[PDB]
Design a protein around this ligand. Structure first.
Ligand code: HEM
Length: 82
């Protein structure tokens, strides 16, 4: 599926933007941190699906209603925002 349509449909848009921080980090900042680190895509994909806490602040990203292939698509698109 298309990452931009997922970004809207799966509700990511409620907590994230690409250039500014809302509830969670901006995607440009995430892409900048995970730069070109080996294995980042798989690691972000897991956090998108199962939830995250502590990396960008004290408040959690709740687990998302995405499938594994959807999470990978989204992770890859977030990383391309750098
Ligand atoms: C929609 C499915 C969605 C995506 C995609 C997404 C991605 C995402 C990334 C890539 C991170 C960074 C994870 C890390 O660096 O390893 C991240 C972080 C947070 N998110 Fe998110 N996110 C999506 C959806 C949502 C929703 C709906 C919310 C708001 C309820 C939310 C919130 C957060 C928060 C907060 C973080 C920071 C977690 C941290 O460790 O500090 N996200 N998200």
């Amino acid at each position: 599926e298309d990452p931009e349509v997922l970004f809207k449909n799966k509700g990511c848009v409620a907590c994230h933007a690409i250039d500014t921080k809302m509830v969670g980090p901006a995607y440009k900042d995430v892409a900048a941190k995970f730069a070109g680190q080996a294995g980042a895509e798989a690691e972000l994909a897991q956090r998108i699906k199962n939830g995250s806490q502590g990396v960008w602040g004290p408040i959690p990203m709740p687990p998302n209603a995405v499938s594994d292939d959807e999470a990978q698509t989204l992770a890859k698109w977030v990383l391309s925002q750098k």
